[PDB]
């Protein structure tokens, strides 16, 4: 009955756990991308 928030890092902090969580929100956009052109447009756009 106790509604504890989930123990995760934050999305906006300047830490190293928070960065991994930002990586997960990018990847979560890939999982929810419908067509394969969308997925391949996400997985290749940041040119490093």
């Amino acid at each position: 009955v106790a509604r504890y928030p989930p123990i995760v890092a934050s999305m906006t902090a300047d830490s190293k756990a928070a960065r991994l969580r930002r990586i997960e929100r990018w990847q979560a956009t890939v999982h929810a991308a419908e067509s394969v052109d969308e997925k391949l447009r996400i997985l290749t756009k940041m040119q490093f």
Binding site: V1, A2, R3, Y4, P5, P6, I7, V8, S10
Partner: protein
């Protein structure tokens, strides 16, 4: 003119003072003892004792869980506030923290303070003791108390 202005103005706005104090309060729920500069500490001391008074309102209370959700930036401390700190202080009604002064900070010579939460596992602070009851003045006054009790 600041008559009856009760809040320090801090940080770089009202929002930023509430985020500074929220970081100090998060630090003190986590570590149970903090050195920080003095004005920041007593501002946050006001907020700290209120936060336990929301911790005693029960885990199941919705308003308490909203306040704990805001005020504790690390979410693992919200089980600590409702199962460690609030059961610890379930007897006494106030005075959950103690604040003392440290010597001034070496860097910029700021007035420094410690607050801890009372009754924590950490080594105790060198608390300022009153003088012994067996001193000269305290024995004269003890004798005087014995005489004024002898009036009845």
């Amino acid at each position: 003119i600041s008559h009856g202005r009760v809040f320090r103005r801090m940080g770089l706005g009202p929002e930023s003072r509430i985020h500074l104090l929220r970081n100090l309060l998060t630090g003190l729920v986590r570590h149970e003892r903090i050195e920080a500069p003095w004005a920041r500490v007593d501002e946050m001391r006001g907020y700290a004792e209120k936060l336990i008074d929301y911790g005693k309102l029960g885990d199941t209370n919705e308003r308490a869980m909203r306040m704990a959700d805001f005020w504790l930036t690390e979410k693992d401390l919200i089980p600590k506030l409702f199962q460690v700190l609030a059961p610890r202080y379930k007897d006494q009604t106030g005075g959950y923290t103690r604040m003392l002064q440290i010597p001034n900070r070496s860097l910029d010579r700021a007035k420094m303070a410690v607050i801890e939460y009372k009754g924590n596992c950490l080594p105790p602070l060198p608390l300022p003791r009153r003088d012994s009851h067996l001193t000269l003045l305290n024995q004269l006054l003890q004798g005087l108390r014995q005489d004024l009790r002898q009036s009845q």
